[PDB]
Design an enzyme around this catalytic site. Structure first.
Site, mmCIF file in Angstrom:
data_model
loop_
_atom_site.group_PDB
_atom_site.id
_atom_site.type_symbol
_atom_site.label_atom_id
_atom_site.label_comp_id
_atom_site.label_asym_id
_atom_site.label_seq_id
_atom_site.Cartn_x
_atom_site.Cartn_y
_atom_site.Cartn_z
ATOM 1 N N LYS A 228 56.602 39.658 -11.690
ATOM 2 C CA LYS A 228 56.637 38.247 -11.241
ATOM 3 C C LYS A 228 57.987 37.655 -11.670
ATOM 4 O O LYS A 228 58.343 37.803 -12.863
ATOM 5 C CB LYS A 228 55.446 37.458 -11.797
ATOM 6 N N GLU A 285 36.143 30.288 -4.802
ATOM 7 C CA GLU A 285 35.482 28.958 -4.845
ATOM 8 C C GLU A 285 33.964 29.125 -4.707
ATOM 9 O O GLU A 285 33.219 28.369 -5.356
ATOM 10 C CB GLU A 285 36.032 28.067 -3.729
ATOM 11 N N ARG A 313 35.847 26.247 1.262
ATOM 12 C CA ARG A 313 35.415 27.662 1.158
ATOM 13 C C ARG A 313 33.981 27.731 0.627
ATOM 14 O O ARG A 313 33.344 28.774 0.814
ATOM 15 C CB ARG A 313 36.337 28.451 0.223
HETATM 16 C C1 TPP Z 1 41.285 29.600 -0.899
HETATM 17 C C2 TPP Z 1 42.398 29.426 -1.880
HETATM 18 N N1 TPP Z 1 42.068 29.122 -3.137
HETATM 19 C C3 TPP Z 1 43.073 28.960 -4.012
HETATM 20 C C4 TPP Z 1 44.409 29.092 -3.669
HETATM 21 C C5 TPP Z 1 45.511 28.896 -4.695
HETATM 22 N N2 TPP Z 1 46.380 30.077 -4.838
HETATM 23 C C6 TPP Z 1 47.591 30.117 -4.293
HETATM 24 S S1 TPP Z 1 48.447 31.515 -4.796
HETATM 25 C C7 TPP Z 1 46.946 32.219 -5.264
HETATM 26 C C8 TPP Z 1 46.764 33.718 -5.240
HETATM 27 C C9 TPP Z 1 46.722 34.374 -6.607
HETATM 28 O O1 TPP Z 1 47.889 35.225 -6.807
HETATM 29 P P1 TPP Z 1 48.145 36.582 -5.958
HETATM 30 O O2 TPP Z 1 47.471 36.671 -4.625
HETATM 31 O O3 TPP Z 1 47.974 37.782 -6.843
HETATM 32 O O4 TPP Z 1 49.719 36.346 -5.662
HETATM 33 P P2 TPP Z 1 51.109 36.327 -6.523
HETATM 34 O O5 TPP Z 1 51.553 34.903 -6.607
HETATM 35 O O6 TPP Z 1 50.789 36.900 -7.895
HETATM 36 O O7 TPP Z 1 52.066 37.204 -5.707
HETATM 37 C C10 TPP Z 1 46.057 31.237 -5.559
HETATM 38 C C11 TPP Z 1 44.881 31.332 -6.486
HETATM 39 C C12 TPP Z 1 44.663 29.397 -2.311
HETATM 40 N N3 TPP Z 1 45.916 29.534 -1.832
HETATM 41 N N4 TPP Z 1 43.654 29.576 -1.435
#
Ligand code: TPP
Ligand code: TPP
Ligand code: CA
Ligand code: CA
Ligand code: CA
Ligand code: CA
Ligand code: CA
Ligand code: CA
Ligand code: MG
Ligand code: MG
Ligand code: MG
Ligand code: MG
Ligand code: MG
Lengths: 539, 560
Positions: A228, A285, A313
């Site tokens: 990251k 969610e 959701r």
């Molecule tokens: C339905 C939903 N809930 C919550 C989020 C908030 N959110 C945005 S990034 C993410 C994904 C978690 O990280 P990951 O997919 O591993 O991506 P990285 O940033 O580590 O590449 C979250 C929880 C979202 N975009 N959509």
């Protein structure tokens, strides 16, 4: 062709699309990779953004666009916050400075922005199901193009990603899933050729490996490991964080559940003070709401902290798992109404519509932190579910021990006037007070309860007013205006009513102020409606 | 007595007086009891018969209600109700004022969760485990989940969270889709590609789900163990009128289910539209797609019990230029709210939703009544909503939806409609209502099932108009303006909640036209409707013909 230096980009200057990228030899791709890193850091730093995720993704995106032939081949990004390099390589480099701004481009992929954007995303875990639809449609048309989805380790734990993976297994169709893991099961992943883990920052070994995997039969997961990030303001979130932290001290039944949005929902301090009463369920969610339901069935007072847009959701979980047995789940809904920059995927303008239709779900709009405290205390001390919704934005800090007695469903008149009365809660109320300021005939009511409404005050105001105006940071379809028209109808009161809110149209990335001015709910727009209703505005 | 052991058993305490060697005889009594008392009311017994042995074993080992036993869906729990003091109520299951067809918290201390929708047991179990640990208690939490429910999004996501939290609980996976050998072989294939160890879940089995003694010995070892545990078990007329089991009275022999009318329409449509593709979340028979699946096998996709996957899969197909149809019940469409809004509606994609079991479904109760779709779909920008009065209008709406841009929803009830000839493809302008009966004193606006009540109610009342409000989004603004200006009073009728539904659409539309007719909004009240016949629910809701005739009498219409 400028001089070699700290911030020259000779390769990128010649890349206007993926075809230009293919003119590079494999050995040149590490130099492009570093150009892309430099470009993202030097343009997309201010306002924070999802810089860290995009930086982590530069090498897999470069390799995918080198191996595949977008837009014939479909590259799907889950969430899309990691695709800044994808936009630089697809003719939008010169627009990156305007990302998330009005007249700029989305912070996520958007189908209508580029032929290179295969899906419009923002909500997580949708890439795999979309990918399946594109593979099935491809096979039906006898076409041969590649479908590749890029999904983060977090996104892959989402219900609809895991359920989709199971189906992708059962269907056995040609597609590539890149699992982008930056943290380093058999019911989800049977039928799926697993490859890796592999170094996610080695752009040549990734180009090598993809040229192998892309032509194989049936579905493949490529597991890549990435680092990251390779390379006066008192918020509603903070006001909530402080209230629930204080509440838990004298209520050992209070348990706060977040779907992996601890910092956003303002629960950092809560997690450290009450680690025994804090649950991060992960991104799902649906799990957050049904888990809260299980806790309420065992005599606890759970609070689900969730964004309005993300609570979408869990609609069926609120209805089926909470509302049918009238359970003690309190919903503290952040990012209520227009959030602005994050655009149509994140604007929380549906909650007053979808929650209202659920039997027994009470809905509150606090005007300030004292009303937030009053609603949370009410919610935690009375039977069945309560929703409390507040916007992204700030409010006056309030002293420790502020816990007013608030009668749920009671409105409050904040400004005298009988000729025209404005009914509004939360952000909409501040607009109403501003709009009415110099007009003595124009009343303002804090409609701080959407379900139930104050039927007595609505009867009194509805029976005397020449006109009512309703204002809501929500769609005008089936929202607060609809609730008011339904309550007036059942009382057989027929006053003139102007329903002000968000139109039945998705609102693209812009400031909340811009959306609110064009929607016609801001103070100037309310002042225009008052004039149209025959109110004499001072010269 | 044929049931000497069962005759002494009024609760799990009585069950624990038996020696383990007597349990096999007890499971044979329970199987004969379920067949003897539940062979009617179109009840499917396969699930409850298959679960007799595990349910007997769990009650023998655990201490309900101190220990919490959670059934996913609850359709497999008949033996549970028989063993927890409800043997003499099983004759009245799904009948008005009788017990539910599913487990219900209000019915019994032994029913840990209210269920109907699938895949909710694991997240509920997590919640109970976390509350137990917070309170310093040590009772057992067991969830019983079918193989189908386990592949649901909220089950697979919950199991991930359950693995991370490492809290004490037992998940019983009841697998009737694969044998022990089929399961072992699939698992051998996969881990050659413990695998459950990284997820944080102890995997036990697969074992024989019909060996009640072996199940008791194995459970006694599992209930002590720390952390989450999955126990995988493996279980086994030519006349003019006809009686309709579904509706409980006589219908014309030319009448078939809306499901069959849809299946016949989409099967015929797909012969001349090569872009049409049907997607179902594992309800092929319910949605009437048996024939479709046989005639168009390469245009048919079952995604399992994952509504969210069905809708977003269809979005992908639409983005690739196809014309997908999602066949889904109204109640199960609630699971895909965000997918409709976020994945279909934002880019205005070509997904047609054919929504069965719209309105009150009756016997299946609060968890299954599809009474919210006119409220939840309506607040989504660009989602068109149609209510067909008959199979001809269904065909006109499906043709419109399949040939015009963006999403369309077509909603129809559990119930019957007249058979219609092949090649019935009327031209219909989406958003146009139709006047069906003259009258300008009081006008009833209604669509679908509500329309049939409206026409019956208005018979032999010359001042009472009836309009087929066959579109909820958009409404017919031109016709509503005309009727709203001319009529003394309007009545709206919907097989849907009065909150934010058709009545709400009408009041919003009238308001923006500055029209102020008297309006009586008739529909399901803002309250969950318990198991009963649809006719019983409609009579108490006030939307059947006699309730409408009473409102007309109150409005001062001369009613015999
Ligand atoms: C339905 C939903 N809930 C919550 C989020 C908030 N959110 C945005 S990034 C993410 C994904 C978690 O990280 P990951 O997919 O591993 O991506 P990285 O940033 O580590 O590449 C979250 C929880 C979202 N975009 N959509
Ligand atoms: C959310 C939801 N979607 C769809 C259904 C419809 N449905 C009822 S039971 C069932 C099959 C469940 O299979 P499994 O859990 O293995 O149980 P079994 O049928 O073998 O008893 C389906 C699709 C439902 N009850 N809930
Ligand atoms: Ca649910
Ligand atoms: Ca409560
Ligand atoms: Ca106030
Ligand atoms: Ca008056
Ligand atoms: Ca089962
Ligand atoms: Ca269409
Ligand atoms: Mg340089
Ligand atoms: Mg990650
Ligand atoms: Mg727009
Ligand atoms: Mg099964
Ligand atoms: Mg009820």
């Amino acid at each position: 062709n400028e001089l070699p230096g700290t911030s020259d980009t000779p390769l990128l200057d010649q890349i206007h699309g993926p075809k230009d990228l293919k003119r590079l030899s494999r050995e040149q791709l590490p130099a492009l990779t570093e150009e892309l890193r430099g470009e993202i850091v030097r343009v997309c730093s201010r306002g924070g953004l999802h810089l860290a995720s995009s930086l982590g993704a530069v090498d897999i995106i470069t390799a995918l666009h080198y191996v595949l032939d977008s837009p014939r081949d479909r590259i799907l990004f889950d969430v899309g916050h990691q695709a800044y390099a994808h936009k630089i390589l697809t003719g939008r480099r010169d627009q990156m400075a305007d990302i998330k701004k009005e007249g700029g481009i989305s912070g996520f992929t958007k189908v209508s922005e580029s032929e290179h954007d295969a899906i419009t995303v923002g909500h997580a875990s949708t890439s795999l199901a979309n990918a399946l639809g594109m593979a099935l449609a491809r096979d039906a048309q006898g076409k041969d193009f590649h479908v590749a989805a890029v999904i983060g380790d977090g996104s892959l734990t989402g219900g609809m990603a895991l359920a989709a993976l199971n189906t992708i297994g059962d269907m056995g169709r040609k597609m590539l899933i890149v699992l982008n893991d930056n943290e380093m099961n058999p019911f989800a992943a049977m039928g799926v050729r697993y490859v890796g883990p592999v170094d996610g920052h080695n752009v040549q070994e990734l180009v090598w490996l993809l040229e192998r995997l892309v032509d194989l039969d049936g579905p493949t997961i490529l597991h890549i490991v990435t680092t990251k990030g390779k390379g006066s303001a008192y918020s509603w979130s903070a006001a909530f964080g402080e209230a629930v932290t204080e509440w838990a001290k004298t209520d050992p039944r209070t348990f706060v559940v977040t779907p992996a949005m601890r910092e956003g929902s303002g629960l950092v301090e809560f997690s450290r003070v009450h680690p025994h009463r804090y649950l991060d369920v992960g991104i799902a969610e649906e799990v957050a709401v049904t888990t809260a339901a299980g806790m309420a069935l065992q005599g606890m007072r759970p609070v689900v902290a969730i964004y309005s847009t993300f609570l979408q959701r869990a609609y069926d979980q609120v209805l089926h798992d909470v509302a049918i047995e009238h359970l003690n789940v309190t919903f503290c809904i952040d990012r209520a109404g227009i959030v602005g920059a994050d655009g149509a995927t994140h604007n929380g303008v549906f909650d007053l519509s979808f929650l209202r239709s659920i039997p027994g779900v009470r809905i509150g709009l606090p005007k300030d932190a004292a009303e937030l405290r009053g609603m949370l205390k009410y919610a935690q001390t009375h039977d069945g579910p309560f929703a409390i919704r507040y916007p992204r934005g700030n409010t006056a800090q309030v002293p420790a021990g502020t816990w007013p007695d608030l009668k749920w469903g009671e409105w409050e008149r904040l400004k005298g006037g009988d000729d025209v009365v404005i009914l509004a809660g939360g952000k909409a109320l501040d607009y109403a007070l501003k709009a009415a300021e110099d007009l003595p005939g124009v009343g303002v009511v804090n409609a701080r309860f959407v379900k139930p409404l104050d039927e007595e005050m609505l009867r009194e105001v509805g029976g005397r007013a020449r006109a009512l105006i309703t204002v809501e940071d929500n769609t005008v379809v089936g929202g607060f205006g609809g609730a008011v028209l339904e309550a007036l109808n059942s009382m057989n009161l027929h006053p003139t009513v102007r329903v002000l809110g968000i139109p039945d149209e998705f609102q693209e990335h812009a400031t909340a102020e811009s959306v609110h001015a064009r929607a016609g709910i801001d103070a100037p727009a309310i002042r225009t409606v008052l004039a149209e209703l025959g109110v004499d505005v001072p010269i």
